[PDB]
Design an enzyme around this catalytic site. Sequence first.
Site, short mmCIF file in Angstrom:
data_model
loop_
_atom_site.label_atom_id
_atom_site.label_comp_id
_atom_site.label_asym_id
_atom_site.label_seq_id
_atom_site.Cartn_x
_atom_site.Cartn_y
_atom_site.Cartn_z
N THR A 22 -16.42 -73.17 29.09
CA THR A 22 -16.94 -72.43 30.29
C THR A 22 -17.58 -71.07 30.00
O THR A 22 -17.95 -70.38 30.98
CB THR A 22 -15.82 -72.17 31.35
OG1 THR A 22 -14.81 -71.34 30.75
CG2 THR A 22 -15.21 -73.54 31.77
N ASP A 49 -11.67 -75.25 29.41
CA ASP A 49 -11.31 -74.16 28.52
C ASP A 49 -11.96 -72.86 29.02
O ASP A 49 -13.14 -72.81 29.18
CB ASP A 49 -11.87 -74.40 27.14
CG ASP A 49 -11.43 -73.34 26.13
OD1 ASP A 49 -10.36 -73.46 25.64
OD2 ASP A 49 -12.21 -72.46 25.86
N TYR A 54 -13.81 -64.05 29.34
CA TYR A 54 -15.05 -64.71 29.76
C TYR A 54 -15.48 -64.25 31.14
O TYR A 54 -16.53 -64.55 31.59
CB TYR A 54 -14.93 -66.22 29.77
CG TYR A 54 -14.62 -66.86 28.44
CD1 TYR A 54 -14.63 -66.13 27.28
CD2 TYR A 54 -14.28 -68.18 28.35
CE1 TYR A 54 -14.35 -66.68 26.07
CE2 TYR A 54 -13.99 -68.73 27.15
CZ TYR A 54 -14.03 -68.00 26.01
OH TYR A 54 -13.69 -68.54 24.83
N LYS A 83 -6.73 -67.70 27.42
CA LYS A 83 -6.49 -67.02 26.12
C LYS A 83 -6.21 -65.55 26.40
O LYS A 83 -6.76 -64.96 27.30
CB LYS A 83 -7.74 -67.11 25.17
CG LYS A 83 -8.20 -68.56 25.05
CD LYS A 83 -9.33 -68.71 24.02
CE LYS A 83 -10.00 -70.12 24.12
NZ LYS A 83 -11.10 -70.08 25.20
N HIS A 116 -6.26 -65.30 21.47
CA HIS A 116 -7.70 -65.47 21.38
C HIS A 116 -8.29 -65.17 20.00
O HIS A 116 -9.15 -65.91 19.51
CB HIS A 116 -8.41 -64.61 22.43
CG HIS A 116 -9.78 -65.09 22.78
ND1 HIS A 116 -10.36 -64.88 24.02
CD2 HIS A 116 -10.70 -65.78 22.05
CE1 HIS A 116 -11.57 -65.41 24.04
NE2 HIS A 116 -11.80 -65.96 22.86
N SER A 216 -17.94 -74.25 19.74
CA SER A 216 -19.31 -74.22 19.17
C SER A 216 -19.58 -75.56 18.45
O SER A 216 -20.33 -75.66 17.46
CB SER A 216 -19.54 -73.02 18.21
OG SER A 216 -19.44 -71.84 19.01
N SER A 220 -23.09 -73.71 19.21
CA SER A 220 -22.87 -72.46 19.88
C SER A 220 -23.87 -72.10 20.93
O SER A 220 -24.91 -72.64 20.97
CB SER A 220 -22.72 -71.32 18.92
OG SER A 220 -23.89 -70.63 18.69
N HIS A 221 -23.49 -71.12 21.71
CA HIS A 221 -24.30 -70.59 22.75
C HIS A 221 -25.54 -69.84 22.19
O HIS A 221 -26.42 -69.49 22.89
CB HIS A 221 -23.50 -69.67 23.65
CG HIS A 221 -22.57 -68.76 22.90
ND1 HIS A 221 -23.02 -67.69 22.18
CD2 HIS A 221 -21.23 -68.77 22.77
CE1 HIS A 221 -21.99 -67.07 21.66
NE2 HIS A 221 -20.89 -67.71 21.98
#
Lengths: 322, 322
Positions: A22, A49, A54, A83, A116, A216, A220-221
């Site tokens: 997310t 998740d 975030y 996390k 985390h 990832s 990954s983003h």
Amino acid sequence: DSKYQCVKLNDGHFMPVLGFGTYAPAEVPKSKALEAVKLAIEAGFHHIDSAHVYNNEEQVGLAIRSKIADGSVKREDIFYTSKLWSNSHRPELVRPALERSLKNLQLDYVDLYLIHFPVSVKPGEEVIPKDENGKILFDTVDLCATWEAMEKCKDAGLAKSIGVSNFNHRLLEMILNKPGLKYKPVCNQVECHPYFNQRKLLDFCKSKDIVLVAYSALGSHREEPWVDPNSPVLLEDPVLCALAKKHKRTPALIALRYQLQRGVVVLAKSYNEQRIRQNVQVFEFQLTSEEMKAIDGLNRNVRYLTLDIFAGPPNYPFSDEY
Amino acid sequence: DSKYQCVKLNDGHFMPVLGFGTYAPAEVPKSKALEAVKLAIEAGFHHIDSAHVYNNEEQVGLAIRSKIADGSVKREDIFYTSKLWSNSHRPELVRPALERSLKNLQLDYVDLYLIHFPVSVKPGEEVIPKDENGKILFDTVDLCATWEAMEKCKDAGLAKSIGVSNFNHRLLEMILNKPGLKYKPVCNQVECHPYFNQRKLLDFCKSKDIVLVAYSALGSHREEPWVDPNSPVLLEDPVLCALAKKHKRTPALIALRYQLQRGVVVLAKSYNEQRIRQNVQVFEFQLTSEEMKAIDGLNRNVRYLTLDIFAGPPNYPFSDEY
Ligand SMILES: NC(=O)c1ccc[n+]([C@@H]2O[C@H](COP(=O)([O-])OP(=O)(O)OC[C@H]3O[C@@H](n4cnc5c(N)ncnc54)[C@H](OP(=O)(O)O)[C@@H]3O)[C@@H](O)[C@H]2O)c1
Ligand SMILES: NC(=O)c1ccc[n+]([C@@H]2O[C@H](COP(=O)([O-])OP(=O)(O)OC[C@H]3O[C@@H](n4cnc5c(N)ncnc54)[C@H](OP(=O)(O)O)[C@@H]3O)[C@@H](O)[C@H]2O)c1
Ligand SMILES: C[C@]12CCC(=O)C=C1CC[C@@H]1[C@@H]2CC[C@]2(C)C(=O)CC[C@@H]12
Ligand SMILES: C[C@]12CCC(=O)C=C1CC[C@@H]1[C@@H]2CC[C@]2(C)C(=O)CC[C@@H]12
């Protein structure tokens, strides 16, 4: 349909093997996480998740409660992960941070709570606290004490399972060897994809019945400055693209199915309705041994997320071999 | 204990990945079958495998119903498999054989119905019909017609899924290439263990979205004359014993885990209460890449169940390379 693929964790709970990521880059508005998580549940994702950091747990919580209230799913069939951020590693602050996440979610428990990232920073309102010269204020915390505090969160029922993220061999050992250990970590959530397949750390985790959870996994983003824009783009890989054509799938699905076949629980973030749906196709095909060996061959030591903002303290996890 | 690990089949149904084998040699009383399936359900097995030819469905069916009636399990959480014996391949005998199994079980449907063995024998009531001098009387039946009768049993709702057993490459292609095919087999259940690991057949099955289900995964019942008493005993293998020692498990549990990790659904038969419970421990550890490779190395072309009493007709499945 009322059924889905899960793995048994070392505390007896079950984790669905495909998880919905997310995290979205800073430029993406909030209403986006809300709709994407609803779509994900609709498509068949039962593992979701997130994390305090975030900045989406209000929206994520709302999506899940919305899909329970509309009858799509029951809370028992959602596996939600949060996390603990590094400014809350002090054991006095662990339960408050978890209760803070539960309040934002409006849920009574998380299914999984993770440490985390193993480098601690000073407590306070800043998620990255800095000194007058702009230097990060690192904190000295014994993660075994942080772990104790996580074990009491599981005893209180606030987290059904506890685990870690971004731990290396030495840091997992430190927990597995801790005096008076009550609950091993159920998982170590780390970057993992065919350009960085983590076989050494995966084998270590299998030898200790810890599940490796891959983030990832699609490359990954690629958000700057966390990821360098000139790192190779995983889903452009020729071998993945050839296998995807052969299978009439996609490079993403190939990357996802690789993890499932090697006993990795795999996350996939998408805020796009077609790709959220496409990613659930992971369960619809299989790879042969020669295809799995070809993907194993792709390993090239590319870590997208080095998080070197946190390098220097001994607990920075990525300077060890594994 | 209401969750458990399943694989999605190509028809959308789910199959639990550990199944309980119910064949026992002639000398074992059938009351042991009733008691064993009740223990298996009590131990957490949700997949139960039998066949008309095992002569135990009255008992297996009663076990299932006994555990439903006691509230231990619901029908929708048992995956029950039966198999069509070779005296009933003629298409006009397929539904009567399925109905006969359902009446003996007192169940309304099976979750899976398999063609047990691709060689047909003369129809009638004997399951191994013989001539004047004790030789088997074979029959000539087109398995594509048999398969069509199987598809009609699925359409009637009497079998939720259909598949095959003891099929080789050629025989699976015969089905997959049949004009007018409505349902692919969901599985091919075959002998599979470290001494005969079926990697060729397994890869082909994965390429066609067919799940391979392993029998004799612990090295077989070793019943004479069906199994050569001189064949090596699987579970005495030094590699399996060494990995069992390293893991604090047993050689049986290593052989079972190996299958789960290569994407095979695995059966295990035990009529011993201790070993029934032990076998579920398959979900409590993981093998590393190094251990999987060492087990891969054991492959040695030992087929315990040659079934060579059925050799001669072209559909005898074990002469081909795979
Ligand atoms: N524990 C930790 O440290 C940590 C740190 C980072 C992330 N994570 C977790 O892991 C999740 C996944 O990692 P990630 O966020 O880095 O992203 P990722 O899953 O590797 O996804 C990468 C990108 O793939 C795209 N995509 C998704 N499905 C696709 C498909 N079928 N075809 C083509 N492109 C596709 C997405 O774009 P679209 O959205 O446009 O589809 C996304 O930008 C995160 O969201 C988070 O929940 C954890
Ligand atoms: N499709 C087909 O053609 C076909 C043909 C054959 C069989 N099958 C199916 O597959 C099933 C399994 O195959 P199988 O019957 O050949 O036997 P199997 O599962 O290979 O092995 C059974 C033997 O192993 C023993 N055993 C079980 N668990 C054990 C453990 N943890 N440690 C040590 N020993 C253990 C059993 O003894 P105890 O009972 O004393 O424990 C029995 O002697 C059958 O029962 C049947 O359901 C199918
Ligand atoms: C954890 C995180 C997001 C997921 C990801 O992939 C990479 C990072 C690294 C830095 C974190 C960031 C989220 C937001 C943070 C806390 C900030 O506000 C400054 C530092 C930054
Ligand atoms: C099919 C079968 C069961 C499971 C197994 O492992 C393989 C065999 C051995 C041969 C079959 C037997 C079942 C009992 C049979 C059908 C007879 O009545 C004479 C031959 C014998």
